[PDB]
Symmetry: C4
Subunit: 316 residues, 4 copies
């Protein structure tokens, strides 16, 4: 009997991952055989510049569970993951890395948490460990900032290693977004979510020169995709500055009448500067409010997500 | 004979509404039985953190008229109402609250007004009563402001308790909008609209610490979704300021030629400040006009709504 | 034999047009009978506040050529025309006014020009005549301005009285736009276009107190929907102002070194003011360029329009 | 046996190309007959103002390989090319010019490079030659700038003469964009790309008065469609200016306390000017970041492009 129903999809983005395919596939097979479930392995070639696709085709010829999504260009790991998840058909989908920095054995644990009713199972590191103090402090500050500014609650130490139920995968597919912060998006599609702790081996504990410009832009993407306060604060700042300018002008007139001293030219210049700056900041704040509305409209997120229905059929 | 056609949908958003389901359903059944019409009760669980969904499933098992829309997350009362209306199939749809602050008996009156040809029947409180003076004054000022700025006429004292005909429900479904002001949207879909007065009981007359930041943001949403004047005023303000700067410069030159006194440096600085501020305000106004056009485009409201046709079929 | 193919659609937007329906329909029938072609009359009730819809239904009961599009609200004459054209099915579509200020007899002439191969036949007044000098001068200046700024060539003295071939009607339907300047849109869908001159009778020559705020907003819509120069000029203005500030600073330093006089504080303030204003104007210009790109994207106009094909089928 | 499968499409945009059709078609037939492949010639009349369409119809009557796309208006060469490619159905598509400035014989070479597995084959001039020094320097500077700012790598000396595989054509059709920089778009859809060198004949080496305003706007389109840095730089500039203002104020206070001299009015004015300018530049930078996100959303580019699949079917 052929099930024809994939229970588990393993999505691996690959970029120059030759001389890693054999070990990765051996470990994955060793982990996935005891699970006794139908599975597929979607390997997404993200424009590799070496003999990765050739070895992938060699493995695909012999192993029926291997499928290849060959992207035209190198789009990056996140976009390769998105493509692999788009082409995945399992009831659960697990993104994993080809270098096996995240132990594939934990897949089993994830599957267990998936069978207890959880729709998202994050694989979270117990501690950051090998990451430098600067990286840890910046990550902690970013998470605190995004928690304060936004209404989403991104769990700590969560990477791309996770299990997503088919329902969560379809919810993520319902989000047409070109500027995606995946951590915030997974927090936003709030289903039954849990986490499984795992200690990453010292082989991959810390070895990375982080490009802090890329990290800064990633944090900016996360903040801007889920908060509009940076656009709203300016109208109130302009109102405060204009009020200060008006109060200063009133005080200058009061000193002119009660002391008989004409207002100095620099004081009038300061009043005009503050008033014009506040008016322009109010205009910028109104523009920012309307631009936030436009951004919300063009992100085109669903108003809601239905997780379960009783007595009703799902709307197309 | 099975009608298979729901005449009335009752949409109830629920968030932690356990220990209220029994009384709510008993009152609703007592009201809806004499109506002698087929009905459904769409209960929308908006991510309740207690045993609300369990009791909802218990009620759904026994009562065939109860259906449950279980949202993945807590999206808020308005979004839960939107989801329930999306899943409703009655000829008329009535959003009601689970705490029964709005008397369900008035449903009957609403249905009567629905059978007289009205497409929207608002349930309006006779007086605000228990609301504090600050709340009443802010609401009155907001309604006056939105009436002056916009072309819509939002009726006073209207809440979410209302009856919408299927035609109005479909018109609202035709509005893809992520930043929705529902009061203004219902005013904008102008069908045959009336209201039914009702005095809310002292049990729910006034007990609420209003978060005026949330109210302010709600008013901002309402003003910005139906008015573009806050974007347009800035170009005229900049034109006025630039004209004043040019007139001041002309007066300074006139005093330089007729009195033989060279222009003081502070006067020239003031002229430059005013001219640059006016030019930047004109630029901000042009940007605001184009941003208002962009906002109108991305709101993607239908150009018109057809209420009735004679000799023609409805366009798909 | 029943043709079942409407050759001509007459679209009439109506708002409080009772006591005009009898004369309008009599004149239209007198004009359209000699044409010996199948026709329909789409009357669009734009939320009339009198017994217009009742008389329209009375006429529709007896006359098989009358169809009624009843809009939910009063959306305005232009939107009512858009709805009527959307519901029209004739090979040619002619928008006409219910008061018959434009002679329906000219319809015949329009039809003639339609049979000579022209896709758009404008009905143009020979002279403005009754319009005041202010109105004529403002219209002439607006048309000159829109001709200079844009690449479209809006013909003079063209109103809503025109004939549009089905191909032009479908091209206009291909333009999803919520901020529409119909004159510019018809110029933009450039098919075989001609005009027929007609002298409007003194009964409707001039009687109108034009709301120049509405006319100004209409002109702004026309300019902004087909020109982006108001967004682009600001970056060049800022560049010029910044260059002037830098040159002034250089001249001040040159006078400081060649004359031994330290730069006065007001001169340094002026340099800073001009430099900051120019930098902010460059920023506003870059924002305006990107906003113009966004506006072009969200207007979603077709890249091209195909008028004829040889050896190919039309793309869906 | 009728193949019914076009192997090669030749897309020719034509604008006033009468007295060139005979030579163009003779040369094209001479080149395309030895290829021994099925082909079509899509001639796109871009609103020609002479007897171009008549001769095109005459040629289409006799030659079964000629098809005509008659655009309603003159939309420009690039849009005419887009329409012709949209109506092309060959496995490979080659845009060529009607004046035959690019030798059609090179088509053969392109086809050869297409059969070696390349999806895009650019026809690149060996040297610019006849172009003036100003044109060459501006082109080189523009290409260096777009290479530095963006992540795309536009090949040098590439024109519209190229071969695109059906897969690349479909990828380009997947890009709904009204503001298109085709060079950057072809760089962005990164498939197997190569180039074929060709020396353009002295008949077309250099004869052109380039409109540098149009070239400047084209370069602006290219930079803005693939870079957001012009929107991002302003927040950092504002931060720097605000920091300088704060440092200047601190230095002034330090001199006030350590020297006992009250701060001059011009110094305080300068501090206020710099602080307000920096705050407004930060606001403009935040607006620019959000506007860049909006532009990315409304460009609606696909997240990825799949070039090949193994074990999976293409997603609809
Ligand atoms: O453009 C691409 C496309 C796919 N992949 C795949 O992504 C998987 C793992 O990516 P990897 O580069 O090994 O990242 P990590 O090991 O998880 O750690 C990263 O941590 C930083 C951000 O997490 C990155 O900037 C660093 O490159 C890297 O050390 C592998 O299968 C790769 O093939 C890439 O890395 N880059
Ligand atoms: O996130 C949610 C989702 C659903 N519901 C449902 O909405 C119904 C009624 O909502 P409720 O909180 O009782 O509001 P009201 O009784 O109508 O009065 C409100 O008046 C203010 C705005 O109307 C609110 O901010 C206050 O929370 C509240 O006092 C109930 O079925 C709730 O279960 C919520 O209230 N919050
Ligand atoms: O909201 C609506 C909906 C439909 N119509 C119909 O439009 C037709 C003609 O409109 P009308 O008001 O008579 O305009 P005109 O006679 O063409 O002249 C106008 O010229 C100005 C702009 O053209 C308008 O602002 C003035 O109201 C009016 O004098 C009639 O069938 C009306 O019923 C309106 O006028 N207003
Ligand atoms: O609006 C249109 C529509 C179609 N075509 C067709 O495009 C082909 C070639 O265009 P052409 O005008 O001859 O450009 P080039 O010979 O490639 O060189 C150009 O180089 C510059 C930009 O490449 C242009 O601005 C100059 O007009 C021109 O010298 C011909 O089949 C034309 O019919 C146009 O040129 N303009
Ligand atoms: Mg790794
Ligand atoms: Mg309540
Ligand atoms: Mg009239
Ligand atoms: Mg040429």
């Amino acid at each position: 009997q052929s099930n024809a129903t994939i229970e588990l999809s393993i999505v691996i983005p690959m970029y120059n991952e030759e001389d890693n395919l054999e070990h990765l596939f051996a470990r994955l097979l060793e982990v996935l055989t005891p699970l006794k479930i139908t599975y597929e392995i979607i390997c997404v070639n993200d424009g590799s510049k070496d003999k990765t696709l050739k070895q992938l085709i060699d493995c695909y010829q012999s192993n029926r569970q291997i499928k290849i999504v060959n992207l035209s260009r190198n789009f990056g790991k996140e976009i390769a993951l998105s493509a692999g998840i788009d082409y995945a058909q399992g009831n659960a989908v697990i993104p994993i890395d080809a270098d096996l920095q995240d132990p594939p054995e934990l897949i089993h644990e994830l599957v267990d948490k998936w069978r207890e009713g959880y729709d998202i199972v994050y694989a979270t590191r117990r501690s950051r460990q090998g990451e430098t103090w600067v990286k840890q402090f910046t990550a902690k500050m970013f998470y605190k900032v995004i928690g304060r500014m936004t209404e989403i609650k991104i769990p700590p130490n969560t990477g791309d290693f996770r299990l997503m139920d088919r329902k969560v995968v379809n919810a993520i597919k319902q989000l047409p977004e070109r500027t995606r912060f995946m951590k915030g998006l997974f927090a936003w599609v709030g289903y039954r979510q849990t986490f499984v702790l795992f200690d990453r081996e010292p082989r991959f504990q810390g070895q990375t020169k982080w490009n802090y410009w890329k990290l800064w832009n990633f944090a900016l993407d996360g903040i801007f995709s889920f908060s509009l306060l940076p656009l709203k604060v300016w109208t109130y700042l302009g109102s405060i500055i204009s009020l200060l300018s008006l109060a200063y002008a009133s005080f200058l007139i009061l000193k002119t009448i009660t002391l008989g001293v004409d207002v100095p030219g620099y004081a009038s210049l300061m009043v005009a500067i503050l008033f014009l700056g506040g008016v322009q900041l109010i205009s910028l704040g109104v523009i920012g409010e309307y631009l936030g509305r436009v951004y919300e409209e063009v992100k085109a997120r669903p108003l809601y997500l239905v997780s379960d229905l009783w007595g009703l059929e799902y709307l197309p």
